[PDB]
Amino acid sequence: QRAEMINRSXXXXXXXXXXXXXXXXX
Amino acid sequence: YNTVIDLRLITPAMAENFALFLQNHYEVMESFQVYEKTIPLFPPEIQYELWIEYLEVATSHQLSSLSPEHIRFLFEKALKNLCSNGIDCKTIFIAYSVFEERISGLISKSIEILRRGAVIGTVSVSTHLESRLQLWRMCISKAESTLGPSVTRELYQECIQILPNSKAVEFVIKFSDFESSIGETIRAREILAYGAKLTELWDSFEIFELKKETYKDMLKMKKVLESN
Amino acid sequence: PSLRDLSLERDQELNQLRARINCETSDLKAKLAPIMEVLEKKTNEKIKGIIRKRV
Amino acid sequence: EKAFHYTVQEYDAWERRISYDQLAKLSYEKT
Amino acid sequence: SNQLLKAGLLDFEKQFGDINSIEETISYKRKMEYETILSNNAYDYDTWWLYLDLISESFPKQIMQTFEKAIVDSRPKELSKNVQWKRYIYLWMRYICYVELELENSLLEEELFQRLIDDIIPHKHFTFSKIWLMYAKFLIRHVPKARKILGKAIKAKTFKGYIELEVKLFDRVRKIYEKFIEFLQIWSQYGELEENLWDRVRGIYTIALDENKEAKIVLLQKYITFETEFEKARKLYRRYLEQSWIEFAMYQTSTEQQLLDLAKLQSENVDEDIENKLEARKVFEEAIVFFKQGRLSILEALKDYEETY
């Protein structure tokens, strides 16, 4: 059953990057 | 000096001494006979140190009466006879590029002469790879500054194909910057997707986002590539 | 160059003995332009000629 | 940089540094 | 047929003998090498250029033949004004100036220019202004015929060159520019020429054309009004309200201090009836610039506070 089991195997950051770009643009 | 060439007793430095002697006394045309009478007598690793003398005196000394095709012949005779023996050549391919640019003014020709110097077929591209990188960078500098969008995109689309992947890193960045500065950023974004190559130059592709959902998709695509 | 300054320094060493003895097509545009400007000025001279006839 | 002071004589010799017919010729030369 | 024998002769002449022999021998050898490169690829136009430059100096009998070979062999197999077309045209321009300055036989010029008007493919795609303008300017050296040359082509560069040629020659270019309007700043040059030569009529034309980012060009009428001093400037200030709060500053500038104050008050009332506090602040700054004017500035400040309140 372990063999049976093992066989089965960003927006906030984007907004933050946009905010960083805006802060740099000022 | 002539009966020391005839006995095959000359050394390379003594031959250059004979040339400088004849040049200092304004028998300049006789010195070219001395470079021709002696360059065939030494192996390739010495000739490149006599050719750099002969081409510089021919191309720059104000008493040389050499027509534009005669010097343009010399630079082809040197570049074939050296490159067939695997000598590194950037001090000749640059001097040729300068001379051709100065006399004819055909900047496309000089760009092509540098390009020829990058794509030399004698040895594998990892051989003399410091010089053969400098030549490419000079060539593309001329191209972007002078010639404009046509030949740049045909030099870049050759340079990236042939240089090893570990050395291509600055060319993709500079190419994408140039294309982005032209505009129509999807064409730039093709190269910015092409940045998936290995090694941390891809961060420049991330920093190139100044050219929001598309940026999030870019982040996702780069994140997938970070574990490929 | 490599051999040249060896020769020069040896020329200095000779003086010891000498002492003891006693925009895609801009590249082509730049080349045609000096002829094109001569044709331009010839055209304008002829223009002034036909103007002087017209008056 | 001592290379610039060898003669052509000293340079052409430094280029240098089998069938039964050629071995026979070499043996004849050696003898 | 022994090319290596020719190489041997050349190596001999390099090592011995006076320069003229080497120059001629090199010229032969380079002629052969340029021919073999060009037959291998006709679209290295740089090689064509150096080949013609070699032929022009060492082989004078051979020149015109090689010009003909160059124009017929090196033509692109493509359309869309590609790079090869942009470079191919310069060979014809070289040939034109050769037959002009060096041969001085103009039947060749008229023949080559007609062959160009045939072979350029202007008929359905991209067209080279450089050859039309060359033909038009050539015909003066050949003069009234230059009208049909322009009409065959009539792409902004063609109109611009023809109008300059008219100006150098002359009044008909105004109607040509009127037709050029069918093809968005050329009206400034038209106005400049007409005001140089008729300012009332030119300004009337500008006013009628304005009666349909166009305002960035329409500001030249304000310059015309300033040069005319000129009551029509008031209509430009009024029409600039197309909002009036931004135009209020220019309205106060055009309006003597009390008149500007009255204009500012009227514009402030308009802004209130429609940001009016910003108009009041602008009026206060206007009073400060004009500077009872300081007391009026203080009153404007108090009224601005009451308006924002």
DSSP assignment of E5-22: HHHHHHHHHHHSS-HHHH
Q: Which residues contact E36 (CB under 8 A, 6 or more apart)?
A: none
Which of C1, C10, C23 is opposite residue B53, by nearest beta carbon?
Answer: C1
Q: How far apart are CA E228 and CA E207, in angstroms?
A: 14
Q: How far apart are CA B208 and CA B215, in angstroms?
A: 11
Q: Closest Cα to residue B174, out of B130, B144, B133? A: B144
Q: How far apart are CA E294 and CA E287, in angstroms?
A: 7
**Could you identify the residue written with the tokens 């065959």?**
E152
- For E120, the 3-state DSSP assignment is coil
| Cα atoms in the Cβ-side hemisphere of radius 13 Å centred on E293 | 14
Please list every residue in chain C whose beta carbon sits closer than 8 Å to the beta carbon of residue E48. Answer: none
Q: Alpha helices of E41-171 — where are they, by DSSP H?
A: 45-58, 63-73, 83-98, 106-119, 129-141, 146-153, 156-168
CB contact under 8 A, B73 and E30: yes
Please list every residue in chain C whose beta carbon sits closer than 8 Å to the beta carbon of residue B106. Answer: 27-28, 31
- Bin B148: left if φ > 0, else alpha if -120 < ψ < 50, else beta: left
- For the beta carbon of residue B153, count every other beta carbon within 10 angstroms: 16
Chain D residue with minimal CA distance to C4? D4
Which of B16, B104, B105 is opposite residue C4, by nearest beta carbon?
Answer: B16
> Does C touch E (3+ CB pairs < 8 Å)?
yes
CA distance C2 to chain D (A): 9
**E290-306 burial, b if ≥16 CB within 10 A, otherwise e?**
beeeeebbeebbebbee
Cβ-count burial of B2 within 10 angstroms (0-12 exposed, 13-18 middle, 19+ buried)? exposed
CA distance C45 to chain B (A): 29
| Cα atoms in the Cβ-side hemisphere of radius 13 Å centred on B16 | 28
> Does D touch A (3+ CB pairs < 8 Å)?
no
Please list every residue in chain B whose beta carbon sits closer than 8 Å to the beta carbon of residue C3. Answer: 12-13, 16, 49-50, 53
Provide the residue type at E232 as one letter.
K
Cα dist. E179→B8, E18, E205 in Å?
A: 82, 66, 15
Q: Alpha helices of chain B — where are they, by DSSP H?
A: 2-6, 12-24, 28-36, 44-60, 68-83, 90-103, 107-118, 131-142, 149-162, 169-182, 186-194, 202-207, 213-225
- For B213, the 3-state DSSP assignment is helix
Q: How far apart are CA E309 and CA E307, in angstroms?
A: 5
For chain A, give the number of residues: 26
Q: How far apart are CA B185 and CA B209, in angstroms?
A: 10
End-to-end Cα separation, chain D, in angstroms: 41
Angle at B207 between CA B201 and CA B213, to 5 degrees: 125
Please list every residue in chain E whose beta carbon sits closer than 8 Å to the beta carbon of residue B150. Answer: 83
Cα dist. B152→B35, B173, B177, B188, E196 in Å?
A: 38, 14, 12, 14, 45
CA distance C1 to chain D (A): 13
Chain C residue with minimal CA distance to D4? C3
CB contact under 8 A, C35 and E101: yes
Which of B10, B13, B45 is opposite residue D8, by nearest beta carbon?
Answer: B10
Beta strands in chain D (DSSP E): none
* CA torsion angle E218 E222 E223 E228 (round to 10): 130
State the resolution, in angstroms: 2.8
